[PDB]
């Protein structure tokens, strides 16, 4: 919805559709008829402590199928992607 491209270069540590972040790999973390639908953390292989409390975004797809109430009508992951996907495409998988 807005211009937020100046964070794809963030590697270490809101009404729009996608939260693009394909270059963030390590985290330590010490109406609503048109909302966010894609958590774009494609290259996320080390969450350290889980601490995952993201819930009830009402449209967030591909969060139940990611192995570490959000979206109940979602498209399937790529069958080559074997059901661990951050998105609908082959390059949107997970490794853990």
């Amino acid at each position, epitope marked *: 919805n807005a211009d937020l491209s100046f964070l794809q270069w963030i590697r270490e540590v809101n009404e729009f559709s996608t939260l693009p972040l394909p270059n963030l790999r390590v985290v330590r973390g010490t109406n609503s008829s048109h909302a966010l639908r894609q958590l774009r953390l494609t290259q996320l292989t080390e969450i350290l402590s889980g601490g995952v409390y993201i819930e009830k975004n009402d449209k967030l*797809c591909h969060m139940d199928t990611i192995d570490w109430d959000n979206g*109940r*009508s979602c*498209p399937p992951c790529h069958e080559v992607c074997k059901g661990r996907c951050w998105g609908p495409g082959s390059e949107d998988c997970q490794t853990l």
Partner: antibody, heavy 118, light 108 residues
């Protein structure tokens, strides 16, 4: 197996209210999905009235304000669309469709033809 | 407010030739763009959802491209089973508005 089908009267006077009912014969209605109404005037594009989620929400498409209403029954899988005070421009083919987040429409039902005149 | 254009509009093309139907959004954000194929007298059927990703059961012949606003429906080799009207879509707002409809006619 998901299938949608619509029923209702053919004509509607500009004084009465047109009522259409969409039923899902695939028994795929959960407290999950969005089911919406789409309009096609003859030789024109596709408009979109609005949807009803699992909870249910008010009218959409601000162009169709105070005219499009959607209801739910949960007994025999009925979603009733009412457009009140038709203004003779609603001579169109109507579709009831499913929804989601990425691929917006999946099955589309079949569509019924409605002509508005006296 | 909202607008949605499909460029080629009427489009002739022969059997077994690349076809590009260029869409547009007039919205800075339309990452989620779907391509439908509506046969004459039938309901629209889903071909592509979310730009590139093809929908289940759709032949891999159809493909999609484009990032910002300029989208592109490509057919690698047109066949006489493709003469339907090809529609666009967007999802970023309350109305999921479609395109004007690009009529594809095979030039036999």
């Amino acid at each position: 197996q998901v299938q949608l089908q619509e029923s209702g009267p053919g004509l509607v006077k500009p004084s009465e209210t047109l009522s259409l009912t969409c039923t899902v014969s695939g028994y795929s209605i959960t407290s999950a999905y969005y089911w919406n109404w789409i309009r096609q005037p003859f030789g024109k594009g596709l408009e979109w009235m609005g949807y009803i989620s699992y909870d249910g929400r008010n009218n959409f498409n601000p162009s169709l304000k105070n005219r499009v209403t959607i209801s739910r029954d949960t007994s025999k899988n009925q979603f009733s669309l009412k457009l009140s005070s038709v203004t003779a421009a609603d001579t169109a083919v109507y579709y009831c469709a499913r929804d989601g987040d990425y691929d917006a429409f999946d099955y589309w039902g079949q569509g019924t033809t409605v002509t508005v005149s006296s | 407010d909202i607008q949605m254009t499909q460029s080629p509009s009427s489009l002739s093309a022969s059997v077994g030739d690349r076809v590009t139907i260029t869409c547009r959004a007039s919205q800075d954000i339309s990452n989620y763009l779907n391509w439908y194929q509506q046969k004459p007298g039938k309901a629209p059927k889903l071909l592509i959802y979310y730009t590139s990703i093809l929908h289940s059961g759709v032949p891999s012949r159809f493909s999609g491209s484009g990032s910002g606003t300029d989208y592109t429906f490509t057919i690698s080799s047109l066949q006489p089973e493709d003469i339907a009207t090809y529609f666009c879509q967007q999802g970023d707002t309350l109305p999921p508005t479609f395109g004007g409809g690009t009529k594809l006619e095979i030039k036999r």
